[PDB]
Design a protein around this ligand. Structure first.
Ligand SMILES: CC(=O)c1sc(CCOP(=O)(O)OP(=O)(O)O)c(C)[n+]1Cc1cnc(C)nc1N
Ligand SMILES: CC(=O)c1sc(CCOP(=O)(O)OP(=O)(O)O)c(C)[n+]1Cc1cnc(C)nc1N
Ligand SMILES: [Mg+2]
Ligand SMILES: [Mg+2]
Lengths: 549, 537
C-alpha cells in the first residue's frame, strides 16, 4: 500500500495520474475491508464512496470549501485522505477514531450528528455565514445519500438554497430506498446521472458544478459494497436478541389480528420488521428516512381503523416529537411506537444513544410508556399496548441480547415486585428498576442486604403514567431510588418524584440514571462503568443516602 | 339567503352557476360579519364550493392542511349558524373538529401534515377494502415549504392509491422549487376564483385513478380590500438595540416575520433576516450552520411550533455547543386557538437538551436583560420564552441572590414558610398569592429565578431556608420547571418538600387565556388556598 501511506492530506492527490488514483482506490478498498472487518463499522457505504471522495478532494479545497457528509457514516475515505489512515486500528473504540466526522479530530470535519438529512440545512447556514462575514469563494459541498434525500429537511433546505446564488453543491450519492419523486426539474441546475465509480467523470461533474457559481445538483450513482462481493450481495449498512423477540411477538399478534400494520423509517432489517413483511407483505410500510411521515401516516392509518406499530430507534424518534403530540396524541389514536436501541448504545457515539425517549414521551398528554425488563415482559407489554384503542403507547428496550427472564414475586397495582426484604431486614429502599436495569437492581439489592439495608425491587412495567402500585409501595419505604437507562432530566425518576409529590407523598426520591450529557463513543459497558451505573457504584451511593437517613 | 338553507354539501349539487356566484357573495359577507383568519377563508370561497361540488365528503375525506382556512367548509357542512360562538369557550373551534362534524378529520393547526394523514388514510382504505375513497389534501403554498410534504409526496408517488393534492397557492412565500415535474400528474395553474374552472380541474383529478396535483391560484382576502402586542414589541425593540452594536447577530423566522417582531429588524438589517418558509427544522439547523460560520443566530419561533425542531436543537445546535438563541413567543396558555396553539411544552422539551440555558422574562426590563445575557453565551444554546399579549409595569426586585431576583420577602415577625418560585408570566400572580398568605400570617419569599434552566445556586440556597417550595409555571407540569427544581434540589441532597403548580399535562379546548387559567385554578385566590393547605400539613 505504497500509494496510500504517502497521502498526508488532500493536495497529495493533486499531481497523481489516473493510474495512480486507480491504484490508490484499490489500496483504499483493501484497507477498508481488513480494518472495518476487525473493528466493525460501515464497510458497504464507504466502499461505495471511494472514487466519489477521491474526486471531492481533487476538486474542492477543504476546509475553505466545507465538505459536509449527510449522516457521516460514509466519511472513512475522507478521514483516510485527511491524515487519519493510521488511526483505523482504533475505529469506533473508546479514545479512538469516531465512526463519524469529529471537529476535535480534524479541521476537515464540520458535522458530528449521525441524524440523516441535515447536511443541506447546515450548508445553507454556512453559505449564509460566508456571505455575512465576506469570506470569498467558499463552496459548501453537501454529500447526501439517496436515503437521506427522502427526509423532509432536504426539501426545506433545497427550497432555501434555490432562492439564492450562494454556491451550494448538492452531491447526491445514489446507490438505490431513494426518492420516488424526480429531482431533475425542481428549478436547480442538474448534472448527471454520473457513474460514481468513474473518478474522472465525478471530477468533471464536480469541477463543472464548482464553476457554475450558483446552487447545482450533481447526481452520482454508486454501488454499496463496491469491490467486496459479500457487501455487494447483502447491501448491508454495517458489519437471543431483544429485536428478534419483538419480531417474533409482533408476528404472533398480527396472526390473530388483521388490524395490525407495521411502519419503519427505512430500517426494516434492523427493527425486526423484514420477517413481519415476509408474512404480511401488504401490512409493512417503509416510508424512507422520514420519521415525521412514519408517525403522521400512522395517525392516518389509525383514523382509518387500524392499529399501527411504528418501529423507530429511540434517538431518531426525536424527529417525530411534534407528530406524536399533535397528530397521534391530540386525536387519541391507537399508535404503538417500538423504540429499539433505547438507553446507551455506546460505539456510535453521542447522536446514537437512546437516552431521550422517556423524557420526551413524558411530555405527551395521555401517553402510556412501557420498558420491558426481559423477553416475556416485551411479549406481554406489546400485547397490552395493542389492547389500548384510545391513545398512543410506546415500548423501549436496548440493543443486544435479552437478559434471562425474571418472574415477579407478585403484581400490585400494575407493578411487578421482583425482590422483597428477606430474613428480618425492613422496607428501607424502594428500588424502581426501569427496563433492562432490573438485573443490575437485583445485584444492588443483594449488596445492600449485606449492608443490613432492606430493598424492595419493582419493575413498574408501564413507567408512564406512574401507577398506583408505585405510590402504594413508596409510603412503606424510607427512600425511593429510580434506576433508568435514560437522561435523568425529565426522566422516569423525576416523573416518579413528581407523581408522589402530586399525591402528597414526600418520601425522599433519588434519580439514578444517565447525566444529561452527550457521551463520546465507547462500548455500552464502558459508558455505564465510567458513569458509575454498576451494581457496585449504585449500592455504594444508596448506602450513603440511607446512612444520611 | 341561501347560506342559512345549506344543510350540507349535497345542497350545492343542483345549483346554477349564477346561484353559486350569489352563494359565494353571501359567504364573503358572512365571513366579514363573523371573523379568526379572515383573509385565508375569503381566498378559498370558490375552491371550497368546488371541492364540495366534486367530492363526496366524508367518503372522500377533505383534509385541510393547518385548518385555519376551513370556515367555508364548516359553513357548507351544516355549521353556518354556529359562527355566533366562533373561538368562544364551548363554541365553534377555529380549526376542524371530529367532535363537531363527520366531515372534519384533523384538529392540529401545525402546518404541512395533511399529505401525511392522506397517505395513511389512503393505505387504511386499501387495507380495509373501502371502495373508491378519494383523499383530498388542501395544502397552502406556505404549508408546501414544510419537509413533511416532501416525505408524504415521495410516499404518495410510490402508489396508485388516489390522493388528490390541491395546492392553494396565494403566494403569486410558497416554494422556490417547481412541483410541475416531480413524477406526479400536474393540473393547472387554475384560476381559484373561477368556481367552474376549479370544478373541471378537480373532476379531472378525481377521475384520473392515481395521485394528482391540482394547482389553484387564489388571492388572500379576495373580495375584501382591507384583507387584500407589548411583549413582542419589547423583544423587537431589544433585538434591534443589540444588533445595532453587534454585526454577528442574525434573525431567523419560520414564515412569521411580522408576528415574531422581526419585520422591524429586517427593515434596519435586511441582509441579517432570513425567512426560511414554514420550516422550523431548517430554521434551527441553518442556525447551526450560521453559528459554525461564527455568527450568533436569534431564531424566533412560537413555543408550540418549536416542537418540530426538537432533534435539530439536540443534535445540530447543542451537540456542537453552538451559540443559537431561540426566542419563543406565545409561551404558556394562548387560549382561543385551542390545544395545538398553547405554548405549554417548551420548558419540558428544552430541559432535555444537554447544556441548555433557558430564561423566562417576568417583565419588559427582564426580557431586555435576559436577551443580552443570552447573546453573551458563546458556547451553547440559549432560549427565552414569554407570553402572547401586553406586558404590564416592571416588577422591581428587593435583591439578586445567586442569579435569582427576590420579588417579596416575609414581613418582619413572619417565618420563612414558603419559597414561591414564580416562572416568567406568573410573577404578578405569585405576588398576589404572597399578599393573601401574608394576611394569614404565612411568610412567603417570591423569587423570579430569571434563568429557569439550569436550576441556579440561588434557588438551592433559598430552598434550605424555607419549609416548603412551590413552583408556579405557565407550562405543562410533566418535566416542567417545578419538576426540574425538585430534581436539582434532590441531586444537591435537599429534601425540602416541593410542589409543582402549573398546567396539567392535557390538551385544552379553546377559551380565553383567563378562562383556561380560572378553570384550572391558576388564580391568586385558588393558588393561595392550595398553599394554605400544604402549610397546615
Ligand atoms: C448510520 C445510521 O445511523 C443510518 S444510515 C441509514 C441509511 C442512509 O441511507 P443513505 O442512502 O443516505 O446512505 P448510504 O448508506 O450511502 O446508502 C439509516 C436509515 N441510518 C439510521 C438513521 C435513521 N434516521 C435518521 C433521521 N438518521 C439516521 N442516521
Ligand atoms: C394559523 C397558523 O397557525 C399559521 S398559517 C401560516 C401560514 C400558512 O400559509 P399557507 O400558504 O399554507 O396558508 P394561507 O393562509 O392559505 O396562505 C403559518 C406560518 N401559521 C403558523 C404555523 C407555523 N408553523 C407550523 C408548523 N404551523 C403553523 N400553523
Ligand atoms: Mg443509499
Ligand atoms: Mg398561502
Amino acid at each position: 500500500m505504497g500509494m496510500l501511506q504517502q497521502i498526508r492530506g488532500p493536495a497529495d492527490l493533486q499531481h497523481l495520474s489516473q493510474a495512480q488514483l486507480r491504484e490508490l482506490a484499490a489500496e483504499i478498498r483493501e484497507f477498508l475491508i481488513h480494518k472495518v472487518a476487525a473493528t466493525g463499522g460501515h464497510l458497504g457505504p464507504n466502499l461505495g464512496v471511494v472514487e466519489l471522495t477521491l474526486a471531492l478532494h481533487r476538486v474542492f479545497d477543504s476546509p475553505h470549501d466545507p465538505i459536509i457528509f449527510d449522516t457521516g457514516h460514509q466519511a472513512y475515505v475522507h478521514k483516510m485522505l485527511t491524515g487519519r489512515s493510521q488511526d483505523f486500528a482504533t475505529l469506533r473504540k473508546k479514545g479512538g477514531l469516531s465512526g463519524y466526522p469529529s471537529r476535535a479530530e480534524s479541521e476537515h470535519d464540520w458535522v458530528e450528528s449521525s441524524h440523516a438529512s441535515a447536511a443541506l440545512s447546515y450548508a445553507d447556514g454556512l453559505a449564509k455565514a460566508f456571505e455575512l462575514t465576506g469570506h470569498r469563494n467558499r463552496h459548501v459541498v453537501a454529500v447526501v445519500g439517496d436515503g437521506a434525500l427522502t427526509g423532509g429537511m432536504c426539501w426545506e433546505a433545497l427550497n432555501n438554497i434555490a432562492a439564492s446564488r450562494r454556491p451550494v453543491i448538492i452531491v447526491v450519492n445514489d446507490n438505490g430506498g431513494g426518492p420516488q419523486l424526480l429531482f431533475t426539474d425542481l428549478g436547480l441546475k442538474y448534472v448527471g446521472p454520473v457513474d460514481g465509480h468513474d473518478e474522472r467523470a465525478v471530477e468533471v461533474a464536480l469541477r463543472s458544478a464548482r464553476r457554475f457559481g450558483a446552487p447545482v445538483i450533481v447526481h452520482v450513482v454508486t454501488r454499496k459494497g463496491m469491490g467486496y462481493p459479500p457487501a455487494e450481495a447483502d447491501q448491508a449498512e454495517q458489519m437471543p436478541g431483544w429485536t428478534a423477540t419483538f419480531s417474533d411477538a409482533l408476528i404472533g399478534y398480527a396472526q390473530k389480528r388483521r388490524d395490525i400494520v407495521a411502519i419503519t423509517a427505512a430500517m426494516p432489517g434492523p427493527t425486526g420488521l423484514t420477517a413481519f413483511g415476509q408474512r404480511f407483505p401488504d401490512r409493512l410500510f417503509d416510508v424512507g428516512i422520514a420519521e415525521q411521515h412514519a408517525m403522521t401516516s400512522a395517525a392516518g392509518l389509525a383514523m382509518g381503523g387500524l392499529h399501527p406499530v411504528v418501529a423507530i430507534y429511540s434517538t431518531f424518534l426525536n424527529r417525530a416529537f411534534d407528530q406524536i403530540m399533535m397528530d397521534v396524541a391530540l386525536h387519541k389514536l391507537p399508535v404503538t411506537m417500538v423504540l429499539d436501541r433505547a438507553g446507551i448504545t455506546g460505539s456510535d457515539g453521542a447522536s446514537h444513544n437512546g437516552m431521550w425517549d422517556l423524557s420526551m414521551l413524558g411530555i405527551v398528554p395521555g401517553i402510556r410508556v412501557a420498558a420491558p425488563r426481559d423477553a416475556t415482559r416485551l411479549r406481554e407489554e406489546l400485547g397490552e399496548a395493542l389492547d389500548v384503542d384510545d391513545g398512543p403507547t410506546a415500548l423501549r428496550f436496548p440493543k443486544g441480547d435479552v437478559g434471562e427472564d425474571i418472574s415477579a414475586l407478585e403484581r400490585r397495582g400494575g407493578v411487578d415486585v421482583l425482590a422483597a426484604p428477606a430474613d428480618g431486614l425492613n422496607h428501607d429502599v424502594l428500588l424502581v428498576a426501569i427496563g433492562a436495569f432490573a438485573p443490575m437492581a437485583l445485584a444492588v439489592a443483594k449488596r445492600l442486604h449485606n449492608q443490613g439495608i432492606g430493598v424492595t425491587v419493582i419493575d413498574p412495567r408501564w413507567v408512564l403514567p406512574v401507577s398506583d402500585g408505585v405510590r402504594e409501595l413508596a409510603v412503606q419505604h424510607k427512600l425511593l431510588v429510580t434506576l433508568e437507562d435514560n437522561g435523568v432530566n425529565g426522566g422516569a425518576g423525576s416523573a416518579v418524584s413528581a407523581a408522589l409529590r402530586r399525591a402528597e407523598i414526600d418520601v425522599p426520591c433519588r434519580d439514578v440514571g444517565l447525566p444529561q450529557e452527550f457521551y463520546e463513543h465507547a462500548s455500552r459497558s464502558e459508558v455505564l462503568a465510567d458513569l458509575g451505573l454498576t451494581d457496585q457504584d449504585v449500592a455504594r451511593r444508596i448506602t450513603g443516602w440511607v446512612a444520611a437517613l
